[PDB]
Symmetry: D2
């Protein structure tokens, strides 16, 4: 249905032609600074439309009760709005960084080979500000960014559309997140990503491409130190390495800016998943 | 944790070195024929080890209470065991057919282009019996099956391992299955598949490869009638077309038969997902 | 947290001093007539304050998507609002009748002995309209109603308050509702009732008072046909007899109209529980 | 269904005439000492029948994986077994004490008035060992215990049965447990207690009897310091005062030792609820 999460929960609402769209976020801890200004930046980024908090805060801080947010005039705004709260909760209680970006438009692919030190260096350093500095295409590889824009213009000229891939990295994630055997972190992430409109998949770490590479190269300490081929999970829980994953989107009514526009949704869904996982993990760290 | 499902539920248990492994299946309807013989075939297929029902049946039929199954001496047997029940429930109350098979070992790829009429014809006709007739490699494409076996033998010679992709088709699925906006059928499937040990991904329909193909070709009525490019879902619910999806597996302790051995787990997880979805859909078909 | 239900779900929001209060109702079937006028009657009854539907309907009918409702300026309105939807869903798909009423204020008790044919006759015939015809006290027993009003006035004179008991009957409930062993119908009802502010308990059927009566009298076919002593449940599922139960409320800031004002909340919570149970039961009636 | 709990979870199985009965307990923290000897005492107490741990431990300690327990030859053993784990988890991580006892058999009532200093003193001091020292009747009030035994013998002579009330106290509970607005601690407890076979109710603190007492006496600081009239909850969360509640049981096949035999089930259900609540509360204490 339209509730997501176990302890950090969002319930959404809203169709195209209705009075409002929004969500209710439940399980946010009391005492955290939160106003509309913490939420608008990511909502503005949905174009490479306002938001008022109805409840759950007082004098700029959260009460620990349900936080309803509404925007006047299905729709993914509630996801992005709720993810902005998750993101702040994670920034404070961890310095987690979540950055998504375009790695494919149509036939044009950024190299994102998990064994490639340059790709790894990009995962280590990329930031939202850098992603946005590229223009609306939001691909931080200048050897292909302009070819992607041209692909988009080829299809726009033909009154056609084409899909792409969004890749996301998460840094500074604590160890132990995820809940085997069925709610392993990668499974919670996949569930999240496949729910996004026009998503057709999910892969983590070495993914589909690493099927071509022998196990020895995935695991050996040198290949020149070993890369992050797991995408930050072992046995279904975070190992403190970077999480990275990719999601393909379909274009089709035509787009064809589906892919760059999907960055904040991917980021939001990631934050919701990681905020839930962090709460669940603190439940049993105590115990 | 180790419970999967909402209305058709399985809770599993078991490590490598413990007294037994098993599961409890909850939400099976009363009155269905079920004995150990309905469960053994798929468990035997885990090699290209017994099982006794502890509860939930009487005189060969289900009571509607929890069905505990145990096998003396984490482990995925409980998944396969519970999936055999799901599969029978779906066969009776639908004629659903679920068939998984190998489409990649290492560098060797079966063509599985969603726009290719031959691939579509294979999705329409493939059966378990045909999959198993190929040998342990379980790839029903003789142009590549023997090259896959040779890839496996190359890596076995090197005391190495290598991964692969399992592709799964579901036929005769009723319309309306899946629960938007967050428990869309493809999201329930992805969650299921990413929980399988050594899984690194999930894609449905046109997937990652269809990112290279314009929207016009995905959607036009002719390309020669339109193929199943969605993989059987629209707006997150089944449309009565074939469901098909693929999952990549890592090899690494080395294998390298991880991929063909994963077929029954993929089938089992698929059946659990579809049995749950079918129950949830009947809840509101009534209403 | 602030979500209630499994398949018929409500998530609520709202504190005393916030911009609005409301809820999101998820799992309502498509095609049912619903506008604000179906919701106002029960909300008006919270005094022995408006409501606008934000989403989930079109041209007076439900879409099957989340129905957000909001009232400008914790709070129990969202419960009552969502329960009005549940109630309509149950009236249509069953002719279920839910009627709550006051049976105790302070020291003044209406006789509600399960073995008493008059009490049983009242359970069989009582209606909301009859309950409200009594005045704000909402106790349909004139031998005690006026003594209850006088009790209230005694305590109001003393700038004090006092509690009471609300009793609720449900008629025409289909058989098979409830989900043993842990979500038995009486357990779902108890969970619901103990969540209401100022509730201190829950009892069904013969309850606390029937502890004094031997088993033979509970079960014998004559005592003059056997009464409904179970309160409509056997083995945790509805048996098609009347459901009846009682809830005590505390008075304390003072009231002392807590008890009569709680009638619509009790009715609403009952409807939410029974609408969920009915959906879950149809899930496996099919199967 | 037959799963109970959110983070501390038990799934049970077993009918009268099946191969075994048992449960799977999920969410127990790793590193805790646990063997069969921690579980047998409470199971023996089910008579005023063995148990083997199948999984989840190694070298006498918990692994953090699912703990399956089985007893060869519905049934409530799995509840009691799982509750023994919950109880140990709570004893270690809190010094919580849970003590249940008989307060009514048939017409014979122990005084349990919340305003009565003697009742309060008993809640403060009662222990299991003291409860069991009374004989199988398990009522620690000698002014009525022998009258209760005689009531039981009156009905046993008549080949009849009669019910009773079990009262339970919890001491040293940390503050903040429970999850408003719908999973308030008293609602989680009520849900738990109404699921026990033959349970017909639940009341906490002043309960049904305190409906007769004005609000001033419930709340005033002196009445001689104020008693615990809330039963240890305010706004649906624990306030660090003693929790106490009572549950009525029906006798009917006849018993009539249903009531004293129900003590360990009540204790077990209490422990499961409080272990879950404690985990959920630690989730957001962190945050």
């Amino acid at each position: 249905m339209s509730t997501f999460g176990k302890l950090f929960r969002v319930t959404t609402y809203g169709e195209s032609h209705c009075k409002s769209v929004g969500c209710i976020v439940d399980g946010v801890p009391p005492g955290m600074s939160l106003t509309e200004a913490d939420i608008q930046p990511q909502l503005t980024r949905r174009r490479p439309d306002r938001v008022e908090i109805q409840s759950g805060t007082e004098f700029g801080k959260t009460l620990g009760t349900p936080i309803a947010m509404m925007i006047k005039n299905r729709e993914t705004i509630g996801r992005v709005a709720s993810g902005a709260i998750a993101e702040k909760f994670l920034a404070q209680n961890s310095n987690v960084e979540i950055v998504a970006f375009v790695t494919q438009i149509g036939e044009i692919k950024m190299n994102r080979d998990s064994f490639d030190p340059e790709f790894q260096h990009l995962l280590n350093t990329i930031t939202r500000e850098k992603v946005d500095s590229m223009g609306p295409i939001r691909c931080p590889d200048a050897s292909v960014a302009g070819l992607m824009v041209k692909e988009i213009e080829k299809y726009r000229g033909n009154k056609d559309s084409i899909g792409g891939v969004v890749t996301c990295v998460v840094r500074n994630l604590p160890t132990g997140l995820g809940e085997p055997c069925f709610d392993k972190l990668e499974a919670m992430l996949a569930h999240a990503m496949l729910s996004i409109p026009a998503s057709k998949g999910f892969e983590i770490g070495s993914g589909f491409q690493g099927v071509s590479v022998p196990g020895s190269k995935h695991n050996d300490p040198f290949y020149r130190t070993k890369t992050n081929n797991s995408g930050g999970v072992q046995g279904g829980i975070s190992n403190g390495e970077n999480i990275y994953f990719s999601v393909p989107f379909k274009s089709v009514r035509h787009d064809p800016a589906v892919t760059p526009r999907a960055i904040p949704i991917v980021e939001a869904m990631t934050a919701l998943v990681l905020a839930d996982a962090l709460l669940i993990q603190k439940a049993r760290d105590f115990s």
